[PDB]
Symmetry: D2
């Protein structure tokens, strides 16, 4: 082959520094990049009207939490709208985040689209004008981008086409980001839907990650200047078998060790519909695995850090401090979990809200 370096030693350093700040020991990411529609769903759930001020207010609640959260929050992913909003104090949101020590992030993909000739499989769009948008994003304080691709497990899925196409689009996305001084989060999300077991998800996860990394190589991506946002290796939600958190940990860590080169700065896990406490325990178990993990493994949770806070809010202005507190709490818990210092680990008799698929009711 022949080389024509995409980045200079100076470009690589900036990307590497940013990537390292976000996942520094004890820190994770707050995913509060819910689209106007997604957020509308949540706000509706807690009986609050999906209004402009309301959205700007709920984001304030999170980004304006007391200094207690600072060493826990390394990065915050915002939606295009939020990025251009102001706080009560006047300060534009990206500033509030930076003053507290966090790196500003922005979701740039434009949704998933169906791939013809498959069984409900998709790919993601958003590459058009990405360079210009990323250029403008870096200008407006943003440093890391988010892009979501989704894969499904089934009898004939994920197919080779979905694996190939999704891997390629991720590499294209990452390439443009790196050119604009923006560290790209690679997010090949494998859906926990179905009744497949643990090994299956682990096999599929390994296959997927393998393709992903080879594509990044083809597109000449500076891996140090990237972060991996994968799904935890877990059994399907409908799976009848039960698994210990330590099994989940072992599955996940092993899968990553067989595919993710040590050059990748970090792995920020998705909650994948797990409960707040469950997400912590699993994360802690992961960091507690006796296997050599050369990358940082932390969190990139949305609902798993907001659930209780959203409820505590309920759209009530007076519940401000109280709701923020629930978030500060989830914050600390996860700061300890990414360090394997989060005590809550050995618990199951009253920790899993999925015993229905274990009961005779599933047979």
């Amino acid at each position: 082959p022949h080389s024509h370096p995409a980045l200079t030693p100076e470009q690589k350093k900036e990307l590497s520094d940013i990537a390292h700040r976000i996942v520094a020991p004890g820190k994770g990411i707050l995913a509060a990049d819910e689209s106007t529609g997604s957020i509308a769903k949540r706000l509706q759930s807690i009986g609050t009207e999906n209004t402009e001020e309301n959205r700007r207010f709920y984001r304030q609640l999170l980004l304006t939490a007391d200094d207690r959260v600072n060493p826990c929050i390394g990065g915050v992913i915002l939606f295009h709208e939020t990025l251009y909003q102001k706080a009560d104090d006047g300060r534009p949101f990206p500033q509030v985040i930076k003053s507290k020590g966090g790196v500003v992030g922005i979701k740039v993909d434009k949704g998933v689209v169906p791939l013809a000739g498959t069984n409900g499989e998709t790919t993601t769009q958003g590459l058009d004008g990405l360079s210009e948008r990323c250029a403008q994003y870096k200008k407006d304080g943003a440093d890391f981008a988010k892009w979501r691709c989704v894969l499904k497990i089934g009898e004939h899925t994920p197919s080779a086409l979905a694996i190939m196409e999704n891997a390629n689009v991720l590499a294209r996305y990452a390439s443009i980001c790196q050119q604009n001084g923006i560290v790209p989060i690679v997010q090949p999300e494998i859906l926990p839907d179905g009744d497949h077991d643990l090994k299956r998800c682990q096999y599929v996860t390994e296959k997927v990650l393998a393709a992903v990394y080879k594509a990044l190589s083809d597109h000449h991506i500076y891996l140090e200047g990237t972060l991996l946002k994968p799904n935890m290796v877990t059994p399907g939600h409908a799976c009848t078998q039960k698994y210990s958190h330590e099994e989940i940990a072992m599955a996940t860590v092993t899968a990553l060790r067989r595919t993710v080169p040590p050059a990748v700065t970090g792995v920020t896990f998705l909650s994948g519909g797990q409960s707040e406490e469950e997400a912590s325990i699993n994360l802690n178990a992961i960091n507690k695995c006796p296997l050599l993990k050369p990358w940082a493994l932390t969190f990139s949770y949305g609902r798993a850090l907001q659930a209780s806070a959203l409820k505590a809010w309920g759209g009530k202005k007076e519940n401000l401090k109280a709701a923020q507190e629930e978030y500060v709490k989830r914050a600390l818990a996860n700061s300890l979990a990414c360090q394997g210092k989060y005590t809550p680990s050995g618990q199951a008799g009253a920790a899993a809200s999925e015993s229905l698929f274990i009961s005779n009711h599933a047979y």
Copy 2:
């Protein structure tokens, strides 16, 4: 594998019918899809200002060609602007085209962007919202589309990356079109730049087309519902070895036979910076090549069809008829070219001219 019907019998018939209609014996394609920036160039070089009206009247000037052109033009590629323009008679352009018996085409790509880490190589964007766009274009009279990818020959180009990426993006575009009833014209354009010889161009052409058709296969593309708009196999514009028309025909056809499968309805050739006459002589030669050609070998020219017409016009509404006459003659000339029934009134056709590269000034 396992089948998952990308299209129904009905959908396939429509694509095939449209496709076949475009390249019927004696018919070619007029490429009038120059974007605002490219059309400016033309009007600028002749001497008329880049006015919207000047562009509408100009394009009218082509599409209003008397019935003589009817059996010649099977399709016309339009740019978005032109699509919603009306002729002086009040009738919208797509309808005018149709009343003459031609099929309306629409360019859908958004230009080429750079592939980081390459030697000036690019890919093409346009996929975002392309599905909804095609559906709108179809309701509006468009039955086929055009997407231009470009590849270059150089000491280290085209590389594996550019080849894979361009063929992949093309397959994507082809899938989105076929879903919406629009026949996709696949354009893997290899530039004639450089001092490379005929054999080099033939070689890379073969490696490009091969990757392309493997790509269409993976994406489950309906070949019968597509068309290939490639470059003729010729030597580089700065090459020293002079070749006969027969030599370029034989090289072109052999490369196609080695890569393009029989199911592809037709091959619409690009001019490639060739003079109006050169294009007709070459095309004619390819059709006169003794080798078996199972697909249509016709044209999809732009400059080769409107060079003189544009000139004759000179922006003056009074130059109208003569300008139009130039076009008809190039339409007729080529109509016979794609049938191997054409002959320039020379002896062994028109000769070759000022090629400083095939002279003492190239050493």
Copy 3:
């Protein structure tokens, strides 16, 4: 990519000449390259002993069928052993084939081996020292070779690995043959085993063929100096669905039209467990198909040419002429069929049962 001529003009011409001779109009291939274990089975079924002497006689009988066979046989695929045996007059078997106007071929693969981590899939060995074997084989009268690869349709097969691998091994084999002056017959054989219907077989046939030609292109294979020996697109042997011959014909032609480039000199179909009649009938139908077929569509039958001749001989030298006329009959019949001239023969004792049950009735 970057060229590096694998063959000189003369080498290409040699290969092309040979390939074209084998598939001249009205001609096909006699596949009599049964391995020691294969011919043993057929011999034992009729009670005849499996000795080199018995084999030499059986092969002798076929190889010297009356001159009426000359125009029907373009080539004969022999097993190693036979290439070195002589006819009763002391003349080397290949020379007996050459004398009759036929081309000599040799089996070169070393059989299929299990693929790990698959559902009983395989690949084919035989590469080691193949270039040396081919140089010698060429010296000894062989002009074309045969390499068999087996793919099986199942709920999840052929897998991406089996397809990729089998295509790669074929391309390596072909390359070696072409470097030693021998025409390689690409045999991507999909088994009729299973209860999959026609549609399923066509889809699988199309996916596998695309991969094959991409690999051949990747390994710089000269298509004109190759022959493709595939399966006709038919329903699985266990399929309950009844299909007419015209459907079988349309499916097979459609699949080839969509994947086999026109530069391929010819397609030599194998019988695939069909009866002698079925083989002639389906191939005739194939040559009747109203679609454009740029390549010679012929036969490469083993059982479809011998089954009846084997029942005439029955191990007794007395039945020499009886056996020979049977095969002469089947050759003449397929010669018509490969030209779409075969008149399907009426009830001739068969049409209830063919020849090889195992035997006829013994207690």
Copy 4:
């Protein structure tokens, strides 16, 4: 996709155990697997005529080294012949190796052959019947195997065909080995020949290694049951720029971190023409590199351990005592280097006993 366990957890256990035993901290591999041809070269140099007895005695000299080498040698690669030879005490070589705590390895490839249509590139053969040989080798005491694949850097090398094919063959060999309980050493050898600089060598290695691991994944290879035998990152033997061992180590470690998954048990570097001292200094530099290294970084030296021992021997039995001491010292010197605890007694000594390899008069 869908899994089909190529190995049972127990087989996986055994493979993992072997791989770990080989590269235990402070241990490395002695590559004494020279073919009859290669060794004859070394013997000629010391006026020793290549004979069955001489070879057997030189191997015995090396293998009978005093017990200090035991904690240095985790394994020894042998050639077929040697596996069945016995030391003067009546016990077969494999038994002795094991007596000294070492694991026995065998070279299984059948050498390289040229790839058609490339700039003199090659691929490796040796797969035919490999499983049977593996079953035999295991029976006789071999626990791991060696397969050499050669890659060359130049103006247009390695080519995609060369990367693709070699990576694929390596994977096929690995699959076969693991099925027989033999730990396969993946050896994608990039030649130091040429005048390319450090940057190019590092860039090429990364691309090759990425391709290799993608192939291993595709073929379902158990990484924990394999080892990697790569070249160190160094400029070509014809390069004129001066590089320090620190730059060498940095380039080397970096490339590995970017491509080799943490699951790979160990990495055994090969001599690469380097002098004995150069090898130890470089291996040590590598271990002293401040970058995170998840896998064991050791050696698999042949000439970098035998050089002075052969010379010392000089074909004189008296020099037996002498020769053995030279070996033990290099081994002890490398046991330390693979632990980053080695130090040169001032200068080195390369140009004095050889003048180096590449291109003095190269064959």
